[PDB]
Write a protein that binds this DNA or RNA. Structure first.
Lengths: 116, 134, 77, 149
RNA sequence: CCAUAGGUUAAUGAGGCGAACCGGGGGAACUGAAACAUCUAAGUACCCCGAGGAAAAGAAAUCAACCGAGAUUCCCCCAG
RNA sequence: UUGAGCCUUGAUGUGUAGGAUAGGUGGGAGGCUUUGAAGUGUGGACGCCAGUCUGCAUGGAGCCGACCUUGAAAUACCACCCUUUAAUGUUUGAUGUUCUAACGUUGACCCGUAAUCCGGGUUGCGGACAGUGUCUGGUGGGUAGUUUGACUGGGGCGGUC
RNA sequence: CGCGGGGUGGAGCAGCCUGGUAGCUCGUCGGGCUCAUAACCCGAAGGUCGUCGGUUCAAAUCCGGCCCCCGCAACCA
């Protein structure tokens, strides 16, 4: 339990999935939910609606911690990214600020050539 | 959970001590701090295997002092319960009564009874604590 | 030598009986290890090669009492 | 064992008890340092009769002897000058020996075995806290500064 | 520091040899078992250390048996 | 810090009938209250989130057993205990950190001494490890001791006993 | 030969231990699906708990066996 007050929601919205993880301010994870965990397998996994239920199933399962307000730091392109923050706000959480932490390199490594 | 009258009952009998024969009935009427005539609860521990059918004991004993003949049947937990007398009896009388039923257990002890039979002897007033006996 | 200074536990020989009782000559070695004992009379340290059970004789008796026996037998302590 | 103590000791004894300690603790620490003596009746009567009222209280007098050491250094601020480089950085990081060498000419005749310095063995240059543990009870702190000679 | 370690001198004794016997410390295998591992051979061969003229053992925390015998060693029986 | 045994104290446990987050058994029907009461404010512990429990207190001195629908009786009083667990006392074990006196040191320096052996002494570094002994599982052709049948139109193979 | 267990639609695992109220994934069908084949998704059909007794309000469970499937330590007639 430990009862935390403020936290931050980490939204890893990539091309195939949109794993949402709610941690505290120090970074320690409390609870998480994914689009692929709430069923939705295959083509429906990479969908903004699946990101909706990912946020809902992560909205709860953190009830024992009782987070009043939290921040949102989205990451990756993903089909969700903006539909998932909607369901997280309409769930009953107070959104203080939203930030974008997409990890773009400065020509660090040679990306794949795949997909013909 | 505790109240006034029960705290008085607790300060007379310490549950952290095993007593001898003649100490038992003397402190027995000191447990009943109510005006109405009460009784004595006899809880004797068995060394039987209650999970195995061949050792579930049941029977009766012809008591020469009454509470007649009282019937009793065990439980699957391993302890059999029954009353044997009341509070306002004389000290001498229940001495022979306790001796009466446990030697009757000598009779009804199973052949498959694995382990020491008589484990723990402890009688108590219906409104008192448990007085242990060696 | 592997002999205890105090007691005198010298290595003994015995068999190494197996499951099929195959007798093979082995050898039992005492539990010897050098130790520094603080003598109170001389107020210094004296190193002796003692067995583990030899140490117990020292702390049950007097450390100086033990040395008195060595002094009476000539074993340089 | 059954050892009978002489001093107090940092955790179990109270100056004259018969606590059953581990064999090693008595044979390698207590006995050789004179903190205690093995429990054999002869030594027990040597203690409970003789030393019980004699050596017991004179053990208290040496406790007062270094109580003397509490403030022998009314100065408590000695300064040493050793060669150092640019921006502090001492070339020869002085050890526990040299710090005792400075106070022997400016105060206490304390030896090496009593000085306890927590913050390393003094590499840096500046304000320092040197704690002198002359006894198991009293702690004497001295503020020293090193100069870039 | 004292003091020990160490150094020097003098006195006394020891070392090596010897056929076997004797006590102790180590200790084989061939062989027999119709093979062979337990076992046997054998605590023998042999090696080593020590003492003597003998050496070892030795005056019961021994047996016996509800009667008694009285340190140890050796020979004959007990008994293949 | 963290497991386990045990003791004490205090909790704990909603097919469904249904006022009951009742496990078995069970003696007798008054406990209870003014060694400061029903109701409620509020947080916490528990939560199959059904409905318990509970520190202080305005309040102010009552609350309810049989009775009834149940297979059962009401933690009103009580005894021996089952499952789940909470504090303490206590008992050992398994880890992490720090320390120094054992121990190691094929580090430095001094002495024995003109001696890279060894021992001793300050000191530096490790440190209850390491390593050695006794017990023990595994591995082990490195090594050792051995076995590895007979008949048989020679032996082997095949077949047989 | 003793110490421990596991037995469940056709089949692999749950739940049992801490009793009342059996879930899960493949294999088959109705299709939905698209000019279609393929992939995908939804719905449905299947064990009354291996079995025989004791106890209890109630047995899949707790406990006695059998049939066994095994995990083994053994294993010097």
């Amino acid at each position: 339990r430990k009862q935390v007050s403020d936290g931050v929601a980490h939204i890893h919205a990539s091309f195939n999935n949109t794993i949402v993880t709610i941690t505290d301010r120090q970074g320690n994870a409390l609870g998480w939910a994914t689009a692929g965990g709430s069923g939705f397998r295959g083509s429906r996994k990479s969908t903004p609606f699946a990101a909706q239920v990912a946020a809902e199933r992560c909205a709860d399962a953190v009830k024992e911690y009782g987070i009043k307000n939290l921040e949102v730091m989205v990451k990756g392109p993903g089909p969700g990214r903006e539909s998932t923050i909607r369901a997280l706000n309409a769930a009953g959480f107070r959104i203080t600020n939203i930030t974008d932490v997409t990890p773009i390199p400065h020509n660090g490594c040679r990306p794949p050539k795949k997909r013909r | 959970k505790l109240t006034k009258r029960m705290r008085v009952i607790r300060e007379k009998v310490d549950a952290t001590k095993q007593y001898d024969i003649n100490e038992a009935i003397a402190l027995l009427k000191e447990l009943a701090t109510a005006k109405f005539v009460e009784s004595v609860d006899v809880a004797v521990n068995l060394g039987i295997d209650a999970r195995k059918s061949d050792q579930n004991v049941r029977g009766a004993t012809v008591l020469p002092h009454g509470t007649g003949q009282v019937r009793y049947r065990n439980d699957k937990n391993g302890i059999i319960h029954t009353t044997i007398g009341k509070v306002d009896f004389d000290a001498d009388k229940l001495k022979e009564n306790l001796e009466a039923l446990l030697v009757a257990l000598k009779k009804a002890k199973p052949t498959q009874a694995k382990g020491v039979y008589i484990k723990k002897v402890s009688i108590s007033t219906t409104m008192g604590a448990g007085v242990a006996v060696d | 030598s592997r002999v205890c200074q105090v007691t005198g536990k010298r290595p003994v020989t015995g068999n190494n009986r197996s499951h099929a009782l195959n007798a093979t000559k082995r050898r039992f070695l005492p539990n010897l290890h050098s130790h520094r004992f603080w003598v109170e009379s001389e107020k210094r340290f004296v190193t002796l090669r003692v067995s583990a059970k030899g140490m117990r004789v020292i702390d049950k008796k007097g450390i100086d009492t033990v040395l008195a026996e060595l002094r009476a037998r000539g074993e340089k302590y | 064992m059954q050892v009978i103590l002489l001093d107090k000791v940092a955790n179990l004894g109270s100056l004259g008890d018969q606590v059953n300690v581990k064999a090693g603790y008595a044979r390698n620490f207590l006995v050789p340092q004179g903190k205690a003596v093995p429990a054999t009746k002869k030594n027990i009567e040597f203690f409970e009769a003789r030393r019980a009222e004699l050596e017991a209280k004179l053990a208290e007098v040496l406790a007062a002897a270094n109580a003397r050491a509490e403030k022998i250094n009314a100065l408590e601020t000695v300064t040493i000058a050793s060669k150092a480089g640019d921006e502090g950085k001492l070339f020869g990081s002085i050890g526990t020996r040299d710090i005792a060498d400075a106070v022997t000419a400016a105060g206490v005749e304390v030896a090496k075995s009593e000085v306890r310095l927590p913050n390393g063995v003094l590499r840096t240059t500046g304000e320092h806290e040197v704690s002198f543990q002359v006894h198991s009870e009293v702690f004497a702190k001295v503020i020293v500064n090193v100069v870039a000679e």
